[PDB]
Amino acid sequence: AERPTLPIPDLLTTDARNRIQLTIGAGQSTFGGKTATTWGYNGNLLGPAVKLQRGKAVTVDIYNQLTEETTLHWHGLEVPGEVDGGPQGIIPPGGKRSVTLNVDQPAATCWFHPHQHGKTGRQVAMGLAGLVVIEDDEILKLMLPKQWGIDDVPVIVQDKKFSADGQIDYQLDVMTAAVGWFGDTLLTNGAIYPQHAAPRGWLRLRLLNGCNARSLNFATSDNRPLYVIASDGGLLPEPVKVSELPVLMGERFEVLVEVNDNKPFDLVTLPVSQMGMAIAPFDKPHPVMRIQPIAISASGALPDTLSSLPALPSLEGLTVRKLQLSMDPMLDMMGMQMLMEKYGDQAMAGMDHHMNHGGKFDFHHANKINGQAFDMNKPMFAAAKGQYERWVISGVGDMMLHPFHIHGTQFRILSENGKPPAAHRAGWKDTVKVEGNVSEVLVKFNHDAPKEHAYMAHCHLLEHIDTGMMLGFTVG
Ligand SMILES: [Cu+2]
Ligand SMILES: [Cu+2]
Ligand SMILES: [Cu+2]
Numbered sequence: 001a002e003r004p005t006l007p008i009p010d011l012l013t014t015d016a017r018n019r020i021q022l023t024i025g026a027g028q029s030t031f032g033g034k035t036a037t038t039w040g041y042n043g044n045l046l047g048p049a050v051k052l053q054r055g056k057a058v059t060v061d062i063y064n065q066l067t068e069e070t071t072l073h074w075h076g077l078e079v080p081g082e083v084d085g086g087p088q089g090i091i092p093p094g095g096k097r098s099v100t101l102n103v104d105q106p107a108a109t110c111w112f113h114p115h116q117h118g119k120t121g122r123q124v125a126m127g128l129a130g131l132v133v134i135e136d137d138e139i140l141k142l143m144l145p146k147q148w149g150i151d152d153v154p155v156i157v158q159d160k161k162f163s164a165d166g167q168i169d170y171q172l173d174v175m176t177a178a179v180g181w182f183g184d185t186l187l188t189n190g191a192i193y194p195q196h197a198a199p200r201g202w203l204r205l206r207l208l209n210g211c212n213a214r215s216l217n218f219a220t221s222d223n224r225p226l227y228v229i230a231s232d233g234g235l236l237p238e239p240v241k242v243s244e245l246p247v248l249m250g251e252r253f254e255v256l257v258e259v260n261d262n263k264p265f266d267l268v269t270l271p272v273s274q275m276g277m278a279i280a281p282f283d284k285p286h287p288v289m290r291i292q293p294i295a296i297s298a299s300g301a302l303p304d305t306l307s308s309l310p311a312l313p314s315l316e317g318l319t320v321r322k323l324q325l326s327m328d329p330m331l332d333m334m335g336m337q338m339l340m341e342k343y344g345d346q347a348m349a350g351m352d353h354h355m356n357h358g359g360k361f362d363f364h365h366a367n368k369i370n371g372q373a374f375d376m377n378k379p380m381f382a383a384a385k386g387q388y389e390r391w392v393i394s395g396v397g398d399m400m401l402h403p404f405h406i407h408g409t410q411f412r413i414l415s416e417n418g419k420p421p422a423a424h425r426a427g428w429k430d431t432v433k434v435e436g437n438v439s440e441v442l443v444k445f446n447h448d449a450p451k452e453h454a455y456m457a458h459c460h461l462l463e464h465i466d467t468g469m470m471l472g473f474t475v476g
């Protein structure tokens with residue numbers, strides 16, 4: 001049997017009333033020939049790509065047809081707290097909420113997903129994620145590959161595991177609270193190892209790591225390079241050639257890759273040094289999708305220059321905020337123990353050389369920032385509006401991977417886990433690696449967020465969010 005074609009999310013623009021309609025609902029999908037209940041936006045699984053233009057306002061009407069509450073957060077969008085769709089942005093089951101997004105940031109690939117309090121991991125695992133394609137005047141002048149689903153394609157990479165009956169096997173338990181929910185089956189826009197037919201020339205891939213907990217590292221099967229043109233928050237100043245591209249949970253990169261006649265190749269993910277993530281089949285390079293060259297010329301360009309990246313400002317005088325991540329030691333130890341007991345030594349491959357005691361010992365509030373498991377009723381601080389701040393985020397105290405994400409902003413990384421950032425990570429980012437060390441970012445918030453619709457700052461390993469590793473903050 002041939003590989004299925006790569007599914008392409010619909011690219012959705014506004015109607016005459018200036019509205020985009022998103023319906024959140026349950027349906028069925030098929031994986032390895034077996035039906036599973038899944039959730040999607042405007043469909044059974046995943047979601048569309050919402051197209052936004054800088055300087056234009058759109059209204060999004062969001063219909064929750066689930067039987068449980070949800071929220072809809074626009075990861076990477078610089079919007080006021082009131083429309084941010086964090087855990088306070090509740091959409092009742094069977095209800096509708098509308099938001100007006102006044103887009104004011106550069107071209108970028110962002111995404112959207114639920115932020116339901118304590119249930120974000122489950123709701124993403126069940127299928128809910130969509131994309132956001134922001135354009136501006138600058139990017140169109142570059143003449144990059146631009147034919148959606150032909151030479152400009154989104155690639156949403158996610159793992160799942162399934163029970164014997166075919167259903168998605170999600171659990172938030174002591175093991176997954178520590179190390180995350182991860183699986184043995186890799187999906188690419190919902191499909192298992194699809195093919196994508198691409199014209200000769202440049203192919204633009206908009207890569208999203210949509211896994212709950214699994215870090216990825218993209219490369220090609222024949223070692224042809226990837227030319228990174230954009231990070232979370234938009235274009236780099238010029239392309240950065242890489243042989244491999246690590247991507248943390250919730251991160252996006254756009255790359256160009258060459259397509260040549262008669263030479264199919266795979267996009268793959270290489271084994272990562274993260275606990276639990278190198279269990280077979282992920283102990284070896286794992287195909288993500290096959291690129292099948294078509295002998296028709298593609299028109300897109302890889303320009304020498306992409307955008308202007310402003311200089312980092314002087315750091316003296318700027319407010320320095322400390323955010324100390326932590327995990328309860330006992331529940332960290334217990335989750336790791338359960339991982340080791342289940343999978344053995346392979347659960348640490350590639351790393352460096354039972355009674356009820358009450359609510360005090362509950363893993364549901366075991367993970368914390370500044371000594372506090374997330375309290376939706378108490379923002380931890382008020383950040384300045386329109387002012388650069390230096391946020392220092394420490395994971396010293398444990399060795400888990402914490403891709404740290406801050407709502408309401410695109411920031412510049414100053415130190416990523418104790419080193420200056422790689423060139424392709426030195427531009428606009430909404431995520432920074434924290435793993436047993438300290439990161440520092442330069443952040444600015446252009447929009448207000450009140451106590452009642454506060455911004456969040458959190459680890460993007462979803463099971464850590466749901467077990468407390470998040471804080472709220474206000475702006476303005
Ligand atoms: Cu996110
Ligand atoms: Cu976000
Ligand atoms: Cu974490």
Ligand SMILES: [Cu+2]
Pocket residue numbers: 073115405407456458
């Ligand atoms: Cu978030």
Ligand SMILES: [O-]
Pocket residue numbers: 073075405
């Ligand atoms: O998020």
